[PDB]
Structure formats: C-alpha cells, structure tokens
C-alpha cells in the first residue's frame, strides 16, 4: 500500500506537525537567525576556499581536505539557505518531489560535512604517528579519501529520495520528517554518533602518544585545547539533534517537534564555526586573510 | 725580506693595471651600440624530467646533444634521454653528497664527486650491461666542485684545496697540478681545442691554466665575492664568471680585461650556474631568485627569462647543437627549455 | 712564509710580459663572430617546430 | 659471458619437454631475453621474448599458447616449457640477450643453443642469393628486401645482420643500418634505406666465411630471412 | 616502435627501483655532526656503535645515520647547503676547555671559540627549522678542572660558586642563549653519561621529539 497520491497536506496532518499557513513572531525570527547563519557560513567558506586554492603554501593534503570542509559547508548553507524561503506559509506551495528535494539538499550537505570532519581525524592520526621527518607526500590518498566522503554523502542524501521512506507505511515513520522513515533515521543518527566516537577516540590516541613521547623528554596546553575544541564544536552543535531524532524514532508522546526548528539552526551552526576552528591555529593561513 | 718583495709584488700588480687601461680603448657598450637587439627570447619548458628525489646539484650534456646526466643528493646519477625523457641509466653512488658531472666527450664514461674528495669514474659501455664504477681519482683534500673530461684518460679536476688537477684515468695519479689559487675552487670550464681551462674560485678571482705546461697564464679579477659558474665564449676567446655579487662578467683572454657586467638593480641573489649559447650572443645565468635570466651577451640587456622552477637553479647547460637548454634546481626536477 | 712571497713574485712578472691586444679589436671578433653564427643558432632565432627535436 | 642451454635431445611427439639455459657472467636480472631457433636444413626462426622482470611475453604464430617462457633472475636461469611438440619443431634453439636502451646492441650474444629432434601482417624480410662464390682478398656485397618500410618515423631502421660461421652460433655484426657491432672488425659496413639494404665487405678472410642473415625488429614477431652463404 | 616499447620498459624498471630506494632512505635519520676538534665526538661516535665520514647504527628499530663532517677543513659556506633536512645537528663541546686555549691563537679561550661556531649553526640561513642536540663531554674532567681552578677566567662576569652543578649550568644556559629563533628550534642538551649507555637513549627521546613535534604541525593540529 503506497500513496505518493496523498499531497503534503495529508502527511503533515497524518503527523502532529502543522502548516503554519500564516507567518508567527517564532517563524520571522527563525527565518532571520538562519538567513543571518547561511550568509555567514557561505561567506567564511569562501575566503578559507579562496585561499587555501590562491597560496602554493596550502597545496598539501591536509589543507586539500580543509578547502572540502570548506566547499561541503557551503553547500550547507546554500540548503539551509533554500530550506529557508520554504518555510512557514511557502510550506503551503511545496510538492512531494520539491520536498524531497529540500530534505535531500540538507540529509547530503551535513552528511558530507560530518565526513570531512572524520576524515580530517584520520589524516592527522596518520600524520601524528608516522616516524620520518619529510615523507615525500602523494595526493592520492586525499582523493580518494574525498571522493568516499561525497560518494557517502550522495547516496545518503538520495536513498530517501527514491527508495528509504513512509510513503509506503504511513503508520511506522517520523513525526518531524512526516515521510522519512525511523529506520532512516535511526540510521542516519547512528552513523553521525558513531562518527563522533571514532573522532573521540583518534584525538584520543594522538594525545596520548604525544603525551608519553614527547613528555619524556608547552605542547601539551596547545593539543589539548585544539582538541577539546574540535570536539566540543561537534558535541554542542549535534547532541541537541541525534537525542532529538532518537527520541522521534523511539519514544511516542514524547514532545520532540517544539525544539526542531532551533535544534537544526544549532546544526547548521556547527558548519559555520568549521572554518574557524580549522583556520584559527594556523597563524599564517589565518593571517592570509585580506 | 717579507717587505722587500711585497713593495715589489705590489708593483708588479701596477705595471698589469697599468697596461690593461692603457688597452682600454673603447668600452664594449660603445662599440655594441648600434647592434639591432635580440629580441624578446621566449622559450617555453618542452620536457620536464622527474625522478629525482633530493635536489639536483649538477648536470652536463652529452656531445650527441640528446642524452644527458644529472646528480643530486639522493645518492644517484641518472642518465636521462631528452628527447623521449626516459631513463637510460640509473647509476647508484657510493657517496650521497654529490656536487658535480661530466659526460665524456665519447660517452663511454661519466664521472661525479663530491664531499667524498674522490672523482668517481663510471663506466657506461660494458660487456656486462650494468653501469660498473672504473676508477676513483683521489688525491684532492678538499671537496670537488667541478670535473671536465679532455679525452677518455684525461679528466681535469677542481676542488675545495685551493687546487685543480689534471689525472691520467688509467694510473689513477695527477699527471699535473695547478696551484695559485688563494680561495676555494669552485667551477672550471675547458675551451673548445681542450688546450685551456679557465677556473673560478672563492677568492673572487678567475685564472686562466695551460692544461700541458701547467702554469697559470693570466689572472682576470674584477668580481667582489665568490665565483660560482665560468664558461668560455664559443670561439674560446673569451669567457663568463657568475658570482655572488649577482653580476655576470664577460672577460677576454687577449686583451685580459673585463668587458661587460650583467647586473640588473632588482637581482641581489647570487649566480649559480652560467653557460652560452651556440652563437654566444646569449648568456643564460641561472640565479638563486629561483628563475633563470637569458642576457643579450654584446649589449647587456636582460631580454628573457625561464622561471619554472620552485627552488634554485643549480645547474644549466646547453646543447653542443643550441637546440635546448636545461636547467636544474633544487627542486628534483630538470626542465629542457627550447 | 717566505717561499710563499718568492714564488709570487715570478708569477706576476710572466702574467705582466705578455701581448695584450686592444679592446677596441677583441670587441669587434666577439661581435663578428656572434653575427657569423647567428643563423645557425637555435635559440636565438626560434626554429619552426618541424626541426625542433622538442 | 658465456650462455649455455639444457634439455633438447631425442622425444616422441606430443611430450612435454623443457628448456633450461644457464646465464653466468653477466647481469641477468636486466636483460630481455629471446628464443631463436634453427631447422636442420633451414635458417633462423623467432620463437619466444621476455622483457626485463617478466613485464612482457610475446610468442611467434605456430607457437603461440604452445610454449611457456619464463626467467629465474635469482638462479641466473631461463626457461622455456614446450607442450604437445609437433613434427616441424626439429631445430636448434639458440638462446640470445637483448637489452633497449637508447643506443643499445640487441641481439649482441648469442648461446650455443641445444639440439632438439622429435621423432617421427608478417614482415617478409626476403634475399634470393645463396652459396655466393667468393675469394679472399675480394669485396663482396650482400643484399637484402623486405616488404615493408623498416624506416621508422625518428629515423631508425631496425635491421639488423647477422653471421654463422660453420658450426658456431649466429654472431651479430650490424645492430641497426649504418652501425657497427662491439668486437667486430671495420671491414663489415652496410648501407640501405626504406626496403633495400646491402651488406658490404671490404677485404675478408678464411675466418668469415659463412651463412648471414638479415633480422627486421620494426614490430614482432621478428621474421629472420634466409641463408647468404658465401662460398668458399 | 618495438625497441622503442621496451625502452619504456627499462624507463619504467628504473622508476620503481628509485621510489623502493627514496622511500627506504626516507626511513633512515640524518644527523650532521660538528663541535671542536677536542671535543669528544671521536667518543660519541665510540658509545654509538679523509673527507665526509658516515656512521650507521641502529636503536629501537630507528636508523640513524650521523655524518662526521669535521675533516674537511674548508669553507663552510659552500658547502654546509647539502645538510638542509637533517632531522638534527649533534654539537659537541668540551666542559673541561674553559681554562685552556687553542695552540694557535694567542689569548682566544676554547670554549669561547665553541660558542664562535655555535652561533653561526644556530642562527645559519639553512638551518632556520633544525633542532641541535648539544653533547656537553668531559663532564668528569671539568668538576676536577672546577675545584681547583676559577670560572673567571673564562666568563669575566659571574655571580656563583665553584660548584659542578652551578657552574655547568651556567655554560649550558650560556650556550643555549645563542638561538635567536627561541620558538623555532629546541636545543636538547645532555651531559656525557659513560656506563649507562645513555647517551645514545637520549638521541632517540630527543630525535623522537623533533619528529613528533613536526608531525604536529603538517597535519595542522599545533
Ligand atoms: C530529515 C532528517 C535528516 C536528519 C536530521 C536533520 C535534522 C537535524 C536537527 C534538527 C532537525 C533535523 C531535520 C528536521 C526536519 C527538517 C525541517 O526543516 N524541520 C523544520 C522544523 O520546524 C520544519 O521545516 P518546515 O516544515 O517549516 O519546512
């Protein structure tokens, strides 16, 4: 039994979600503080894209993945950005193909940045632990470890839009995302969390090693303050959203949609700060900026 | 005395000032005024050889103007095809620190030297397919900063003992040794009937060696700093010095002065590697700045330059024919300019 | 050091007694040279790519 | 230097045998090896190559998926496995080194080869001269045809000569036209272009008397041509 | 062409056997070495294990090569440019050279002329990254040398006692005030242990650091 018969209408009145044919003081402020986080996300990704591209300087692996954190944010803020000017009444003019063209822009966007951000956990552990000074460097492995973030990123993002969603089961599927369906997003918040705990456990291990080797012989301070800012940036800004989408996908009546619209504004927060706590430390990078 | 022969020695260095400018009719910027220039010389990196994993520190044509060699610090010495930038030959060296090539004239052999104080002779034509070391020249004190082949048992070497030398291959001696110079030897060139050779030291100052007798004929100085690179005018009247004062200086060997300056206010680094070309109206110098100037040779006018490389320009040479010019660099990579 | 002061001596004095011919006239072999050789030079007059081994 | 070979002798058809051939004195490891194998009673015919570390195995046409070549560089060793032998592969396999390289001498030494007798889009490289009488002392002048233009695009005609003193093994003599081999005296010179080639000695001796041969290498499978004996 | 095909061949043979040996020698560590004449590198060298001399020795599955470059007695200016991209520059000095002098200049102290060359390593335009472990030897010799004779002699100001352990530190605070790129480059410095084997322990914990502090900095995480 498949409806892609039932308009938008149906879905978000089969759901608890409501329309909001009419525009709210929460709904004009929500639109101001995104417009105000995508044009800040799209701006900042453009000067750490710029300049990681304009400067021999950065033409190595590590900054070759910075600039795809770069262009992968930014193509956080241009869905976020479109997400936008289709809320509130817009909703109203959605179809099913446009709405899931919407939510696909977000599911890819995000997803590619959480890559990149676990990628870059690899890349430095790998860079940490090896025992040669110069190591005449290939770009081959930051390509290939590109192209899989984007490939993960596309097929996450298009699963739902074809095949992994409630237009078949109406009654087992979310109450925030009326048609993606728990199992998608079980998956898709599993997949982040265990994102994170690989991050947490790389960055773990660096510090440790740094810490007995070079402690046997203040670089301590420095590592563990970059540290705990890549991985703060990234527990502030998604914990709010993985326990909400968990708490969708399993408990009923549990009251989850209030918080929605901030929790994903927080989300998309995170891709704005990327190109500053990536950029940050590096004093000459940082000063390229003009 | 000490003093006695001083305030004579002092002299003497008169009557030799005294002289040159009494031949110092007419400055070669005068007499070159009314040459139509060169023309904005555009050359363009035609093949790019890669493979070397260090810097490049020397390399030397062969005289069929298609093979060449090249040495750096990773220990190896490569004999490269030009024309289809494959490698023929990949001679591993005992000693890493390499800063010097020659390809003999007959391309049977190729010899490198360098911190080791031993001039290597490698042997390319052997019945057994695989480049065997012949012999190792070692009697130098110090480091060998240039060698050139006269023939495939002679070998003229320089080094860092203030002393150039010329060997016989087969006995392994030096057949003859020049001394006089009062700084380290940095760079010899041999004239095209490989009876003279012109040799550039630290003392910033060039002397003119008579490679039978053994005795310098003339001494040219003029330069403020160290000299890098020499290399004669094709017709072997005549001779260029590359030195840290980032001047290139164009002296003549019958009338024993100097004629041009190649400076240019916006060089201050030091000249690395100089060479001619086949006509000698032009001078390519290859400077630390990491590029390469090409200079008009009669007029003293930068018309040209061949910036690829990233880091400095150790070494460049031009083909016996002047179809090509390549120069190396720090950078591994050896560029054929054409 | 008193070899040293000897032998230099008898250096500069052979290096003084030799011919040295005008500048004026050496000036003009390398221009006339350079002009003898100039059409057969590759560099200085770019050959069409039809001969060029490159 | 020397290149010796093992196997060959007397075997009923349709057996497997295997040829052995020894390198020593030289270094292996670097050489592009070939089979060369010659008929009781007819001239040389190219069988088998490998490239150095194994990277390329060519075949000639009546043995092609019949014969398994392969190299041992550690042991100095190479190896050729024969199935299913047939009546017609009664020869003589020589067993030659070749190495590329710019200005190289392929086909410059040669085995003694092993005796094998079973019991019971092709260059035609073409010379219609045969038991040619000559005297010592003469110039003689040997000419050879192909079917096709041997001048390459960059100017080099892969022909190659060849010479068998009675009962040796092949000697070469001319590694490409217009060159001279290591080891042989400058009486030898040849001069061609396109598809016309000659071979020309100036005085000879009672030491070069012989069979020559001409060899193309423009593109496998390298076809030899007949015999030139001179008489004598 | 089919000569021409396996041409490429050999070219191709020749690259991958120059990559297995770029990356074999990237394993290896350079170390330059340099110091005085007397200063007790021929004893370094002893505990580890004309021209440019080469040794070769291995600890803890690391390789380390130290070039001993004292014998060639020319211009270091032309020559010290090969050394670029060592991991380190071991120096040593003597302790117990503070009282003497060289043989050959009149009043110019030993351990003065030590600082002289340490100046121009520290602060030369090719070493502007490399970390310097600095071996101060003799350490037995100079607490002998200490108790009998003053620290004056050498150092005209000096507030401290004739005690081994403010008089060397004086020296090796001393010589590590020559860098002016503080934040650069770390000065490692060690005093000659005999029996425990030390020494070469040292090199390892010291060439670790450089290492691992530079790691740092590729991957940006520093
Ligand atoms: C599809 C799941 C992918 C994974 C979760 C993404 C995420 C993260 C953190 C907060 C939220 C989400 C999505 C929530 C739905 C998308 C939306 O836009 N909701 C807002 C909530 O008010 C209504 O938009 P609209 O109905 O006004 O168009």
Redesign the pocket.
Known sequence: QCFYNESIAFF?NRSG?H??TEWNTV?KL?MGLGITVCIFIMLANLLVMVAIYVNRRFHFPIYYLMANLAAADFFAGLAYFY?MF???P??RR?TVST?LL??GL??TS?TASVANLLAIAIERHITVFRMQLHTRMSNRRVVVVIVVIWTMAIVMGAI?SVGWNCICDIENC?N??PL?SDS??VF??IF?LVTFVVMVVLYAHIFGYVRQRTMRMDTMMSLLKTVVIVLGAFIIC?T???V??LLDVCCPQCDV?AY????????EFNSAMNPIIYSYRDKEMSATFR | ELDQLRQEAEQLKNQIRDARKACADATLSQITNNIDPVGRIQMRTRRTLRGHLAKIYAMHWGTDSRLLVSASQDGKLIIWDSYTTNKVHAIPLRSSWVMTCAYAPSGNYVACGGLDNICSIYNLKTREGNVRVSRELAGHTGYLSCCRFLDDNQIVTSSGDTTCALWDIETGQQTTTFTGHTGDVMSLSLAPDTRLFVSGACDASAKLWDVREGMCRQTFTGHESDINAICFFPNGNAFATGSDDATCRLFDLRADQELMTYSHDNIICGITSVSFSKSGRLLLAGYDDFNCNVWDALKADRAGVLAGHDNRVSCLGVTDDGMAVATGSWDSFLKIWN | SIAQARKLVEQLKMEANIDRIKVSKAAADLMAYCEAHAKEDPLLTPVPASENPF | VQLVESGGGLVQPGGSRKLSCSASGFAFSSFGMHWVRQAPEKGLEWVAYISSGSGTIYYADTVKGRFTISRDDPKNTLFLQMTSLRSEDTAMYYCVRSIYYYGSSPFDFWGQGTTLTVSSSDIVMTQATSSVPVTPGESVSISCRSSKSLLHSNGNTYLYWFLQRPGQSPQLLIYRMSNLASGVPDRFSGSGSGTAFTLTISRLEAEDVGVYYCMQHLEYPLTFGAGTKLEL | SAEDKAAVERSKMIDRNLREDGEKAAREVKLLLLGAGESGKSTIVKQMKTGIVETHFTFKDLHFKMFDVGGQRSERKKWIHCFEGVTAIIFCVALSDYDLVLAEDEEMNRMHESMKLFDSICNNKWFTDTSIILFLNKKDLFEEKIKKSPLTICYPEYAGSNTYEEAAAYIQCQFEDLNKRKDTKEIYTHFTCATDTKNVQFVFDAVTDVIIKNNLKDCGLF
């Open positions: 978000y979600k329309l909001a709904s929500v997400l289709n809320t509130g817009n909703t959605l709405w919407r939510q977000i599911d995000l739902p979310s925030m995302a993606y998608y997003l898709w918040a982040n998604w709010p959203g993985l909400l989408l949609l929605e619209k901030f929790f994903l504004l927080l989300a």
